[PDB]
């Protein structure tokens, strides 16, 4: 099957600079055609730019916006693709995406990686427990969870028991704090027995900051 | 640059109906040596890339299911989903490859599940000790798997409606049982916190009058 794997992203002052990589298999990595297409958080599909294989002179072409700014390359032994993104800007700030499909029907694509282009600074969050209790339990079922306070930039993974927990969790979209800082919340539901038996414990990853919580989540 | 514009900006469609979403774009991609329209259709899942549907304006990619088909010509285009599925909730993009460098997306649609009113099950969050000691408290009111999304929660300190020291975020729809979650929180000095009965108070389509879920401090 085809897998294009991005890394790269992360949190780049205006004017600075970053390089995306993309590691391909499952093609012939020579013979194929990539573009950079980008999405804002929470906007559409921006195409980025071209590359040619060898074969027809690989050329590379970009969009007006990003034009004399990035430079699009290919590592044929590696089979890697590259994206240099030069005197960045805000509106830089964006998911961006190698893809292949020639013809330009872009028919695979990469999972993506974050670049946020911002002067302030990185933060990692506070995590406090969202304790089950009377008031947070119907049914036989209860709530419980992580409030994940105070971070930037996006993004923060949350875990449950170390990632053995998924069915019933909920990780809520982050709000912006008039503090220029994020916070969320990540809740699951479970039965209610389970609260006599099993230790709940969320697992926060900060990237960014190289910050990790792990937090037990008891009743009270 | 060929722009394209997609109708409407959402839909919302019961299990099982028909759900149909348009594209136009400001010149034709019909190529007259072949017949071919170079046209489009990506469907994109939250936290995934988009996904190729549809190419040639009509042709199903290999493994897409029968139940998504194109039609259209020249300036105009659609997609229906014969039958639409409660996995099927996405953001729609089509997209021109007839006039190369850009290539063009359109801006989206969103396709929503229009179910049965669902009222939310209401829990509510004290602030933990731990963040009690560093000056501040967050209380969390907590509206799991409710539809339709619009809801209004209000909070009260000692019965004393709350205004501008709260923050909300609402799930995308859930797609196995179509529903949303959400989750409000309330910010205060650990000082103003610790001088007052907290509520949240939920209005709702699906309540036949407002909920309100409430602790005291006294006894958490």
């Known amino acids: 099957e085809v897998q294009l794997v991005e890394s790269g992203g992360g949190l780049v002052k205006p004017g600075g600079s970053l390089r995306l990589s993309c590691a391909a298999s499952?093609?012939?990595?020579?013979?194929?055609?990539f573009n950079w297409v980008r999405q804002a958080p929470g906007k559409g599909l921006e195409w980025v730019g071209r590359?040619?294989?060898?074969?027809?002179?690989?050329?590379?072409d970009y969009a007006a916006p990003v034009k004399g700014r990035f430079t699009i390359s290919r590592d044929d032994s590696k089979n890697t693709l590259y994206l240099q993104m030069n005197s960045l800007k805000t509106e830089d700030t964006a998911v961006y995406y190698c893809?292949?499909?020639?013809?330009?029907?872009?028919?695979?694509w990469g999972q993506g990686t974050l670049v946020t282009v911002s002067s302030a600074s990185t933060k990692g969050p506070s995590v406090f427990p969202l304790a089950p209790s009377s008031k947070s339990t119907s049914g036989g079922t209860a709530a419980l969870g992580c409030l994940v306070k105070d971070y930037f930039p996006e993004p923060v993974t949350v875990s449950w028991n170390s990632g053995a927990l998924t069915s019933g969790v909920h990780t809520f979209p982050a709000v912006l704090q008039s503090s220029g800082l994020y916070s969320l919340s990540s809740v699951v539901t479970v039965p209610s027995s389970s609260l006599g038996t099993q230790t709940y414990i969320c697992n926060v990853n900060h990237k960014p900051s190289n910050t990790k919580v792990d937090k037990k989540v008891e009743p009270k | 640059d060929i722009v394209m514009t997609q109708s409407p900006d959402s839909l919302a469609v019961s299990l099982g109906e028909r759900a149909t979403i348009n594209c136009k774009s400001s010149?034709?991609?019909?190529?007259?040596?072949?017949?071919?329209?170079?046209l489009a259709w990506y469907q994109q899942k939250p936290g995934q890339p988009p996904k190729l549907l549809i190419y040639?304006?009509?042709t199903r990619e290999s493994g897409v299911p029968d139940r998504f088909s194109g039609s259209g010509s020249g300036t105009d285009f659609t997609l229906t989903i014969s039958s639409l599925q409660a996995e099927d909730v996405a953001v729609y993009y089509c997209?021109?490859?007839?006039?190369?460098?850009?290539?063009?997306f359109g801006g989206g649609t969103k396709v929503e599940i229009k179910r049965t009113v669902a009222a939310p099950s209401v829990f509510i969050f004290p602030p933990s000790d731990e963040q009690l000691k560093s000056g501040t408290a967050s209380v969390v009111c907590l509206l799991n798997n409710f539809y339709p999304r619009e809801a209004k929660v209000q909070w009260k300190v000692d019965n004393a409606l709350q205004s501008g020291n709260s923050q909300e975020s609402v799930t995308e729809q859930d797609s196995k049982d179509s529903t949303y979650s959400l989750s409000s929180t309330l910010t205060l000095s650990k000082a103003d916190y610790e001088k007052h009965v907290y509520a949240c108070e939920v209005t709702h389509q699906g309540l036949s009058s407002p909920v309100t879920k409430s602790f005291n401090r006294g006894e958490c």
């Open positions: 893809t292949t499909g020639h013809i330009t029907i872009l028919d695979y």
């Open positions: 499952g093609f012939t990595f020579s013979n194929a055609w």
């Open positions: 590359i040619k294989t060898n074969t027809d002179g690989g050329t590379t």
């Open positions: 010149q034709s991609v019909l190529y007259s040596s072949n017949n071919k329209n170079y």
């Open positions: 040639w304006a009509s």
């Open positions: 997209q021109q490859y007839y006039r190369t460098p850009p290539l063009t």
